[PDB]
Every structure is written in C-alpha cells, then in structure tokens.
CSV table of C-alpha atoms in Angstrom, one decimal:
chain,number,residue,atom,x,y,z
A,1,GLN,CA,20.8,8.6,6.7
A,2,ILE,CA,24.4,7.9,7.3
A,3,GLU,CA,25.9,9.4,4.1
A,4,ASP,CA,24.1,12.6,5.0
A,5,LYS,CA,25.7,12.5,8.5
A,6,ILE,CA,29.3,11.9,6.6
A,7,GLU,CA,28.7,15.0,4.6
A,8,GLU,CA,27.6,17.0,7.5
A,9,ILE,CA,30.9,15.8,9.2
A,10,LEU,CA,33.1,16.9,6.3
A,11,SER,CA,31.3,20.1,5.9
A,12,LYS,CA,32.2,21.0,9.7
A,13,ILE,CA,35.5,19.8,9.0
A,14,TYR,CA,36.1,22.0,6.2
A,15,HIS,CA,34.7,25.2,8.1
A,16,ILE,CA,37.0,24.3,10.9
A,17,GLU,CA,40.1,24.0,8.7
A,18,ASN,CA,39.3,27.4,6.9
A,19,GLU,CA,39.1,29.0,10.3
A,20,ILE,CA,42.5,27.4,11.4
A,21,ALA,CA,44.0,29.0,8.1
A,22,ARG,CA,42.7,32.3,9.1
A,23,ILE,CA,43.8,32.2,12.8
A,24,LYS,CA,47.3,31.1,11.7
A,25,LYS,CA,47.3,34.5,9.6
A,26,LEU,CA,45.9,36.5,12.5
A,27,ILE,CA,48.4,35.1,14.9
A,28,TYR,CA,51.4,35.9,12.4
A,29,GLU,CA,50.1,39.2,11.8
A,30,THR,CA,50.1,39.8,15.6
A,31,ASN,CA,53.6,38.6,16.3
A,32,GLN,CA,54.7,40.6,13.5
A,33,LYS,CA,53.2,43.7,15.6
A,34,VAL,CA,54.7,42.6,18.5
A,35,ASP,CA,58.3,41.8,17.3
A,36,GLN,CA,58.3,45.5,15.9
A,37,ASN,CA,57.0,46.6,19.4
A,38,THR,CA,59.5,44.8,21.3
A,39,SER,CA,62.6,46.3,19.2
A,40,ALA,CA,61.2,49.8,19.4
A,41,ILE,CA,60.8,49.3,23.3
A,42,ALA,CA,64.5,48.2,23.3
A,43,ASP,CA,65.7,51.3,21.2
A,44,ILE,CA,63.5,53.4,23.7
A,45,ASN,CA,65.3,52.1,26.6
A,46,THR,CA,68.5,53.2,25.1
A,47,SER,CA,67.4,56.5,24.5
A,48,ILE,CA,65.9,57.0,27.8
A,49,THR,CA,69.1,55.9,29.5
A,50,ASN,CA,70.9,58.3,27.2
A,51,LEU,CA,68.9,61.3,28.2
A,52,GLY,CA,69.2,60.3,32.0
A,53,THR,CA,72.8,60.1,31.7
A,54,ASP,CA,73.2,63.1,29.5
A,55,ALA,CA,70.3,65.6,31.0
A,56,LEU,CA,71.5,68.4,33.4
A,57,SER,CA,69.0,67.3,36.1
A,58,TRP,CA,67.5,68.2,39.3
A,59,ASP,CA,69.3,66.8,42.3
A,60,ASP,CA,66.8,66.4,45.2
A,61,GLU,CA,69.5,66.1,48.1
A,62,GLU,CA,71.1,69.4,46.7
A,63,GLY,CA,68.0,71.2,46.2
A,64,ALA,CA,69.5,72.5,43.0
A,65,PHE,CA,70.3,71.4,39.3
A,66,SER,CA,73.6,69.7,39.3
A,67,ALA,CA,76.4,69.6,36.6
A,68,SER,CA,77.6,66.4,37.9
A,69,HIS,CA,77.8,63.9,34.8
A,70,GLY,CA,78.6,60.3,35.3
A,71,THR,CA,81.9,59.8,37.5
A,72,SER,CA,82.7,63.4,37.3
A,73,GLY,CA,81.3,65.4,40.2
A,74,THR,CA,82.0,69.0,38.6
A,75,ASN,CA,81.8,70.1,34.8
A,76,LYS,CA,81.5,72.8,32.7
A,77,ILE,CA,78.5,74.5,31.1
A,78,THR,CA,79.3,75.9,27.7
A,79,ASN,CA,77.9,77.6,24.8
A,80,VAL,CA,76.1,80.0,27.3
A,81,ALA,CA,75.3,83.2,25.7
A,82,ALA,CA,75.8,86.5,27.6
A,83,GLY,CA,73.5,87.2,30.4
A,84,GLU,CA,71.7,90.4,31.2
A,85,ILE,CA,73.5,92.4,33.5
A,86,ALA,CA,70.8,94.2,35.7
A,87,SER,CA,69.8,94.2,39.3
A,88,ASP,CA,66.8,91.7,38.4
A,89,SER,CA,68.5,89.3,36.1
A,90,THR,CA,68.4,85.9,36.7
A,91,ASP,CA,70.6,85.1,33.7
A,92,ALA,CA,73.5,83.1,34.1
A,93,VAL,CA,76.6,84.9,33.1
A,94,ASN,CA,79.7,83.7,31.0
A,95,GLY,CA,83.4,83.9,30.8
A,96,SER,CA,83.4,86.7,28.5
A,97,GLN,CA,81.4,88.7,31.0
A,98,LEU,CA,83.4,88.1,33.8
A,99,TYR,CA,86.6,88.8,31.4
A,100,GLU,CA,85.1,92.4,30.9
A,101,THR,CA,84.8,92.7,34.7
A,102,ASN,CA,88.0,91.6,35.5
A,103,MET,CA,89.4,94.2,32.9
A,104,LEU,CA,87.5,97.0,34.5
A,105,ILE,CA,89.2,96.1,37.6
A,106,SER,CA,92.8,95.8,36.1
A,107,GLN,CA,92.3,99.3,34.4
A,108,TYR,CA,91.0,100.8,37.8
A,109,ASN,CA,94.1,99.5,39.4
B,1,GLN,CA,28.5,0.9,16.7
B,2,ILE,CA,28.8,3.4,13.9
B,3,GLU,CA,26.0,5.6,15.0
B,4,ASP,CA,28.0,5.7,18.5
B,5,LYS,CA,31.2,6.5,16.4
B,6,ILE,CA,29.4,9.2,14.5
B,7,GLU,CA,27.8,11.0,17.5
B,8,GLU,CA,31.4,11.0,19.1
B,9,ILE,CA,32.9,12.2,16.1
B,10,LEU,CA,30.3,15.2,16.1
B,11,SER,CA,30.6,15.7,19.9
B,12,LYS,CA,34.3,16.4,19.3
B,13,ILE,CA,33.6,18.7,16.3
B,14,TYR,CA,31.3,20.5,18.6
B,15,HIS,CA,34.1,20.9,21.4
B,16,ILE,CA,36.6,22.0,18.9
B,17,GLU,CA,34.4,24.7,17.3
B,18,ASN,CA,33.9,25.8,20.8
B,19,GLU,CA,37.5,26.2,21.1
B,20,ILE,CA,37.8,28.2,17.9
B,21,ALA,CA,35.3,30.6,19.2
B,22,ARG,CA,37.3,31.1,22.3
B,23,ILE,CA,40.6,31.4,20.3
B,24,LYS,CA,39.1,34.0,18.1
B,25,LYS,CA,38.2,36.1,21.0
B,26,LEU,CA,41.4,35.7,22.6
B,27,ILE,CA,43.1,37.1,19.2
B,28,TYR,CA,40.9,40.2,19.2
B,29,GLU,CA,41.7,40.8,22.9
B,30,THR,CA,45.4,40.4,22.3
B,31,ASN,CA,45.2,42.6,19.4
B,32,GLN,CA,43.3,45.4,21.4
B,33,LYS,CA,46.3,45.5,23.7
B,34,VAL,CA,48.9,45.2,21.1
B,35,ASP,CA,47.2,48.2,19.4
B,36,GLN,CA,47.2,50.1,22.6
B,37,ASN,CA,50.9,49.7,22.9
B,38,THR,CA,51.8,50.8,19.5
B,39,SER,CA,50.0,54.0,19.9
B,40,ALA,CA,51.7,54.3,23.4
B,41,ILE,CA,55.1,53.6,21.5
B,42,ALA,CA,54.2,56.3,19.1
B,43,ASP,CA,53.8,58.8,22.0
B,44,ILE,CA,56.7,57.8,23.6
B,45,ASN,CA,58.8,58.4,20.6
B,46,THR,CA,57.5,62.1,20.2
B,47,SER,CA,58.2,62.8,24.0
B,48,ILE,CA,61.6,61.4,23.6
B,49,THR,CA,62.3,63.6,20.4
B,50,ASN,CA,60.9,66.5,22.2
B,51,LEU,CA,63.1,65.8,25.6
B,52,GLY,CA,66.2,65.4,23.6
B,53,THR,CA,65.3,68.6,21.8
B,54,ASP,CA,64.7,70.7,25.0
B,55,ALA,CA,66.8,69.3,27.6
B,56,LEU,CA,70.2,71.0,28.2
B,57,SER,CA,72.5,68.1,27.8
B,58,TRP,CA,76.0,66.6,27.7
B,59,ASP,CA,77.8,67.2,24.4
B,60,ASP,CA,80.7,64.9,23.5
B,61,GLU,CA,82.2,67.5,21.4
B,62,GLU,CA,82.4,69.9,24.6
B,63,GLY,CA,83.3,67.5,27.2
B,64,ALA,CA,80.6,69.7,29.1
B,65,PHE,CA,77.0,70.4,29.1
B,66,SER,CA,76.1,72.8,26.1
B,67,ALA,CA,73.5,75.5,25.7
B,68,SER,CA,73.1,74.9,21.9
B,69,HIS,CA,69.7,74.9,20.7
B,70,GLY,CA,67.9,75.4,17.4
B,71,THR,CA,69.6,77.5,14.9
B,72,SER,CA,71.7,79.1,17.7
B,73,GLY,CA,74.9,77.5,18.9
B,74,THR,CA,74.7,79.6,22.1
B,75,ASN,CA,71.7,80.5,24.5
B,76,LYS,CA,71.1,81.9,27.6
B,77,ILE,CA,70.2,79.9,30.7
B,78,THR,CA,67.8,82.0,32.9
B,79,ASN,CA,65.9,81.8,36.1
B,80,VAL,CA,69.0,81.1,37.5
B,81,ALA,CA,69.4,81.7,41.4
B,82,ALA,CA,71.9,83.4,42.9
B,83,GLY,CA,75.0,81.3,43.5
B,84,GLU,CA,76.9,81.1,46.8
B,85,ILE,CA,79.8,83.6,46.4
B,86,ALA,CA,82.6,81.6,48.1
B,87,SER,CA,86.1,80.3,47.5
B,88,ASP,CA,85.0,76.7,47.1
B,89,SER,CA,81.7,77.4,45.3
B,90,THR,CA,80.7,75.6,42.5
B,91,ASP,CA,77.1,77.6,42.1
B,92,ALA,CA,76.5,79.2,38.7
B,93,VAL,CA,76.2,83.2,39.1
B,94,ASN,CA,73.6,85.4,37.6
B,95,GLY,CA,73.7,88.5,35.9
B,96,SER,CA,72.3,90.5,39.2
B,97,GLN,CA,75.6,88.9,40.9
B,98,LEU,CA,77.7,90.8,38.1
B,99,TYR,CA,75.7,94.0,38.2
B,100,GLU,CA,76.7,94.3,42.0
B,101,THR,CA,80.2,93.5,41.2
B,102,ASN,CA,80.3,95.9,38.4
B,103,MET,CA,78.4,98.7,40.5
B,104,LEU,CA,81.1,98.3,43.2
B,105,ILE,CA,84.0,98.9,40.5
B,106,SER,CA,82.1,101.6,38.9
B,107,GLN,CA,81.6,103.3,42.3
B,108,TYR,CA,85.3,103.5,42.9
B,109,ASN,CA,86.0,104.9,39.4
C,1,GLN,CA,33.7,1.9,3.2
C,2,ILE,CA,31.8,3.5,6.1
C,3,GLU,CA,34.3,2.4,8.7
C,4,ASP,CA,37.1,3.6,6.5
C,5,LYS,CA,35.7,6.7,5.9
C,6,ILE,CA,35.4,7.2,9.6
C,7,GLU,CA,38.8,6.2,10.2
C,8,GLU,CA,39.9,8.8,7.8
C,9,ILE,CA,37.8,11.4,9.2
C,10,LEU,CA,39.3,10.6,12.8
C,11,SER,CA,42.8,11.0,11.6
C,12,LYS,CA,41.8,14.6,10.1
C,13,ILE,CA,40.4,15.3,13.4
C,14,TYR,CA,43.5,14.2,15.2
C,15,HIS,CA,45.6,16.5,12.9
C,16,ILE,CA,43.3,19.4,13.9
C,17,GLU,CA,43.6,18.9,17.6
C,18,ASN,CA,47.3,19.3,17.5
C,19,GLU,CA,47.1,22.3,15.3
C,20,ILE,CA,44.6,23.8,18.1
C,21,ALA,CA,47.0,22.7,20.8
C,22,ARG,CA,49.8,24.6,19.0
C,23,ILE,CA,47.7,27.6,18.3
C,24,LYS,CA,47.1,27.8,22.0
C,25,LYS,CA,50.7,27.7,22.9
C,26,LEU,CA,51.5,30.4,20.3
C,27,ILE,CA,48.4,32.7,21.6
C,28,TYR,CA,50.0,32.0,25.4
C,29,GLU,CA,53.6,32.8,24.3
C,30,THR,CA,52.7,36.1,22.4
C,31,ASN,CA,50.8,37.0,25.4
C,32,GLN,CA,53.7,36.6,27.7
C,33,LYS,CA,55.6,39.0,25.2
C,34,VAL,CA,53.0,41.6,25.3
C,35,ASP,CA,52.6,41.7,29.1
C,36,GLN,CA,56.3,42.1,29.4
C,37,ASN,CA,56.2,45.1,26.8
C,38,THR,CA,52.9,46.6,28.4
C,39,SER,CA,54.9,46.7,31.6
C,40,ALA,CA,58.1,48.1,29.8
C,41,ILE,CA,55.9,50.7,28.6
C,42,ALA,CA,54.7,51.6,32.1
C,43,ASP,CA,58.2,52.0,33.1
C,44,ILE,CA,58.9,54.2,30.4
C,45,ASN,CA,56.0,56.4,30.9
C,46,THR,CA,57.4,57.0,34.6
C,47,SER,CA,60.9,57.9,33.3
C,48,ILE,CA,59.7,60.4,30.9
C,49,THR,CA,57.4,61.9,33.2
C,50,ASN,CA,60.2,62.2,35.7
C,51,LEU,CA,62.9,63.3,33.1
C,52,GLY,CA,60.5,66.3,32.4
C,53,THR,CA,60.1,67.2,35.9
C,54,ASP,CA,63.7,67.0,36.6
C,55,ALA,CA,65.6,68.1,33.3
C,56,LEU,CA,66.6,71.9,33.1
C,57,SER,CA,64.7,72.6,29.8
C,58,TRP,CA,64.1,75.1,27.2
C,59,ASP,CA,61.6,77.6,27.8
C,60,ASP,CA,60.1,79.0,24.3
C,61,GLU,CA,59.1,82.2,26.0
C,62,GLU,CA,62.3,82.9,27.3
C,63,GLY,CA,64.2,82.0,24.4
C,64,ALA,CA,66.4,80.4,26.8
C,65,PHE,CA,67.0,77.3,28.9
C,66,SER,CA,65.2,78.0,32.3
C,67,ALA,CA,66.1,76.9,36.1
C,68,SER,CA,62.8,76.8,37.3
C,69,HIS,CA,61.9,73.6,38.8
C,70,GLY,CA,58.5,72.6,40.5
C,71,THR,CA,56.8,75.6,42.3
C,72,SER,CA,60.0,77.2,42.3
C,73,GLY,CA,60.4,80.0,39.6
C,74,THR,CA,64.4,80.4,40.1
C,75,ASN,CA,67.0,77.9,41.3
C,76,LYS,CA,70.7,77.3,41.6
C,77,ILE,CA,72.7,75.2,39.3
C,78,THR,CA,75.7,73.8,41.2
C,79,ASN,CA,78.7,71.6,40.7
C,80,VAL,CA,79.8,74.2,37.9
C,81,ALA,CA,83.4,73.6,37.2
C,82,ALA,CA,85.1,77.1,36.6
C,83,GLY,CA,84.5,78.5,33.1
C,84,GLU,CA,87.4,79.8,30.9
C,85,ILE,CA,87.8,83.8,31.6
C,86,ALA,CA,88.4,85.2,28.1
C,87,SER,CA,86.6,87.7,25.8
C,88,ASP,CA,85.2,85.1,23.7
C,89,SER,CA,84.3,82.4,26.3
C,90,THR,CA,80.8,80.9,26.5
C,91,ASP,CA,81.7,78.9,29.6
C,92,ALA,CA,79.3,79.6,32.7
C,93,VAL,CA,81.3,80.6,35.7
C,94,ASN,CA,80.9,79.7,39.4
C,95,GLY,CA,81.0,81.4,42.5
C,96,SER,CA,84.5,80.8,43.5
C,97,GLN,CA,85.4,82.8,40.3
C,98,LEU,CA,83.2,85.6,41.3
C,99,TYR,CA,84.7,85.8,44.9
C,100,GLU,CA,88.2,85.9,43.4
C,101,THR,CA,87.2,88.9,41.3
C,102,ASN,CA,85.3,90.6,44.4
C,103,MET,CA,88.8,90.3,46.4
C,104,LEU,CA,90.7,91.7,43.5
C,105,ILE,CA,88.4,94.8,44.0
C,106,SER,CA,88.6,94.7,47.8
C,107,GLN,CA,92.3,94.7,47.7
C,108,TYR,CA,92.4,97.4,45.2
C,109,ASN,CA,90.3,99.3,47.5
C-alpha cells in the first residue's frame, strides 16, 4: 500500500513538473509579445508627438487654423498651387497670383 | 507517522495543483489582454501612417508648412474662409478676394 | 528506505514551491507592464482622435487640403507669414499683402 502511495505521489509530481515547464514557456512567449508592444508604443508616442508638433492644426481660441509652429508665432505655408480666381472660390491664393495682380496694377498705372 | 507524512504530502500536492490551475487561467487572461493590445497597436500604426500622409505639415526643408502630397509637390488648399484684409492681418486670402481685387483693377482699365 | 524516499519527495516539493512563487511574481510583473501599455494605448487613441479632428487635412474629392472643420465647411487660416510675391512663388499670401495691393489700386485711382 505504501509503495503504491509513493508511486501515486511521484506520478503527481511528474505531472506538476511538466505543467511548470509549459508555464515557463507560456510566460516567456507572453513577455516577448509585451516587450515588442512596449517598444512599439514608445515609437508611436514619438510619432504622435511629432505629428502634434508639425500638423497645421485648429486653434480653438482663435476659431481658425493656425500656422504658428513651436516657438514661432507666424510662418509661411508653401507649395500652395494656384487657387481658382472666381467669386465663389474658397481656394487659397499664392504669391504668383498676387504677383500677376500687382503687375496688372503697375501696368494700369 | 509515515501515513501522516504521506497524507500531508498529498495535501500539499493538491494545493500546488490548485495553484497551477489558477496560474493557467491567469496566463490565458493575460494573453487575451496582450492580443487586444497587439491588434490595437496595428490599428494605431495605420492611423498614424494615414495622419502623416494626409495632415498638412511642417517641412524641415522648407522652414514652412508644405502642401506637397502624393506625386505633386504643390497642391491647392481649399475651403479657406475669407481672410481679414487689414494692415496687420496674418489671415490667408482666398480666390474670391483676389477676384474682387482683379475686378476693381479691370473696371479701371 | 521509505523515510528517505519521503525526504527526497519533500525536497522536490520545496523546489516546486519556489518555482511557483517565482512564476506568480513574473505574472504579476507582466501584468503591471500590460496595464501600463493598455493605458498608454488609450492615451494614444485619444491623441489620434484629436489630431484627426483638428488637423488641416487632405480631401480626396477636392484633391486638395481642406480648411473644413467640425460642422463648418469653410474656415480661416491665420498666423500666416507673408508669402514671396514672385512669378514662381507657391507661398500663401496673407491679408496684409492683399491690403497693400488694394491700397496701390485706391492710390492709382
């Protein structure tokens, strides 16, 4: 009876040991995925910070989009293609267009 | 005394088996959270990619905001409300405003 | 022999107990990281939502950046520095520049 009980005990111990081995694998696999995600989050935080710094964004107090950037309150917007010149146009106009207008005036004068 | 000892060992083995059952559940639960975050991060990466592509942003080669996009280095900005026309105005002006100016000149000529 | 067997069994159970305590600690530590990451992803989703609402963004149907915002189909862009007035300038122009042009015309008249 006691040798049987010892065999029972040892069988139970082997099973526990096997389960523990698998658990160590599972915790490792998990911690690899978590480390991956922690790194990814760090990179995302940088990207979000940069987008926030660099996007031309709405200014609630001004009730308009603002071309302020960092420590510079006013800045150019460039690479703006020519806007439609019409009574209903809501396109921004660029310096080539104002140049043309100024030339019409100087020619007029 | 050895029957007592055997029963105490079997008791502790039962306890350990219970711990292992709990541990397995915890690991599964933890992995469900990690899975959710891994998939949330993939979604975030796409969002950030698209925001970077679509937000009018600062350009460190221009020292200005740049309307480059896709295969065109210049693009229009539209749905721009009329800017204040005043000596100290920093508002963008639209094609309707330039149209009016051009019309004043034209009528004179 | 059997008293000896029992001693060896107890020694192994002691080792198992140490492994279980370590595993618990590792799972705790993993979950502290996962919690930190879940929160960080929550913050990121808020930043992304806000950047989307507030960035001046590309509009596929317009093929242009759009100063639409919220319920308002058109809005101002302000804090725009004066653009180059030249035949190949792609700088946006501001209200102070159009004011100046408008005063040339009113002078010429």
